[PDB]
């Protein structure tokens, strides 16, 4: 087993460990960052395999979270029109519709104010106006194989969660671990175009 991954932004290691439910013939088939949450200057981010959907067929659910920070100068949010960029890893197939597109039915985007996207539309929140997700979108390109979430505005104890499912491609090499994602990042602030923060990356393999 690889013991670590490396955050590209700051070039420090994170530990990775066995995912519960991934044991098969005395070996484990999946690894998660430990811890899977990372404290960044703007708040907290996280990424993990959060469930095993079908171990033999190498299908897993993936979960990302982000939460922000309130600053007084005027209140301001540390995450302000922020963007998540989440490329699928090499040999990782995102689970898509019958139509071959990433549709509302293939992901969830929810927030801790009780808002969520429903068929692409933000609903709920304490004002029933879409709340924390009023301006959020989930985008996918089938060629680049990359999810983006735009429109994040988050202060203290304001948190958003994304889930989706993936499957290891049949062309896997035996015993090789594959990162579930390419470099996965949060750009917290539209006003700071060069500030980027890495999410840690889970890994999977088959025999
Ligand atoms: Ni629904």
Numbering used by the authors: 145 to 217, 588 to 721
Which sentences from the paper describe this structure?
RrgA harbors two intramolecular isopeptide bonds, one located in the D2 domain, and the second in D4.
We provide evidence that two engineered protein fragments from RrgA retain their ability to associate covalently in vivo and in vitro although being isolated from the parent protein. The amide bond formation between the Lys and the Asn side chains is dependent on Asp6008. The covalent complex His-Jo-His-In was formed only when both WT forms of Jo and In were mixed, while each point mutation totally impaired the complex assembly. The reaction was efficient at pH 8 and pH 7 since 100% of the complex was reconstituted after 1 h, the formation of the complex was slightly reduced to 90% at pH 6 and largely inefficient at pH 5 since only 18% of the complex could be detected. This pH dependency suggests that a residue, likely Asp600, with a pKa value between 5 and 6 might need to be deprotonated to participate in the reaction mechanism. The structure of the complex shows that the Jo and In moieties grasp into an 11-β-stranded sandwich. The two partners are locked together by the isopeptide bond formed by the fusion of the side chains of Lys191 and Asn695 in proximity to Asp600. The structure of the complex is indistinguishable from that of the RrgA D2 domain (rms of 0.61 Å), indicating that the fold adopted by the Jo and In partners produced individually, although possibly different from that acquired in the context of the full RrgA sequence, still remains compatible with the complex formation. Parental RrgA and Jo-In complex structures were superimposed and neither significant differences nor flexibility were detected despite slight variations observed in a few loops (depicted in Fig. 3e by arrows). The purified product, His-Jo-GSTPGSV-In, folds into a circular single polypeptide chain containing the covalent isopeptide bond as confirmed by ESI-MS.
